[PDB]
């Protein structure tokens, strides 16, 4: 095929799989926040249902990276708009 | 160089990056989600061994992003197939 | 435009969206990894003081991908080197 043909194939090629390891990689994260804020969740249910009625300073952390996560899928997403339309390359 | 070996030698060089950032990502998700698991299992055995013979409603919950990180894997190794042969960049 | 200026144009793009993307991705995991470790250390300080005076093999383990974010971090900075510098493309 035409050079041109070949480089903008491989490139587009390569922005699809990109885009799949983007959208893995946000859903994994979104994965490990919930699982991290639950787990925060139970540590303290678990100081608070010692200490009530039938350690004080124990305090587990929650984690938000959704602005991270929402930024993967966009430009998991906008990545389209970086194609190269084959039928823009003249001839 | 010509401008086609310019384009196509930027973009080899792009992919390789891009190759070991996908490795890294797999690398760091799967340490968070053993590090995840290890320690909802610790909760989980405090649980416990509050309650055995020398708080019931706590759990602590598991994490699993195997099939992302996999895919990220997959993605790094098979961007291979996207790199431009420039000896296919006929004269 | 000319077929090599809109397939450097596309690539410099899509460079640009995959450098943000690394960013994001590497300021997730940071968070994640440090969420993950200050709540190893609240469940090791629970543990500890439920039994110093006013269970013992339970342990949480902390993760350390630091080297994974700062890879991240050095490809979306590198990548720049990989942009296609539209002034070397002769005509």
Redesign the interface.
């Given at each position: 095929m035409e050079?041109?043909k070949?480089?903008?194939n491989?490139?587009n090629?390569?922005?699809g799989?990109?885009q799949?390891?983007?959208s893995?990689?946000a859903?994994?994260?979104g994965?490990?926040?919930?699982?991290?804020n639950?787990?925060?969740q139970?540590?303290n249910?678990?100081?608070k249902?010692?200490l009530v009625p039938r350690?004080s300073g124990?305090?587990?952390?929650?984690?938000?990276?959704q602005?991270?996560?929402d930024?993967?899928n966009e430009?998991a997403k906008?990545?389209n708009?970086?194609?190269?339309d084959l039928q823009?390359?003249?001839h």
């Open positions: 050079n041109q070949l480089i903008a491989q490139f090629s390569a922005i799989k990109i799949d390891s983007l893995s990689t859903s994994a994260l994965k490990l926040q919930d699982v991290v639950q787990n925060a139970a540590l249910t678990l100081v249902q010692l350690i124990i305090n587990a952390s929650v984690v938000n990276i602005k991270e996560i930024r993967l430009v906008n990545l708009e970086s194609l190269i823009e390359l003249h």
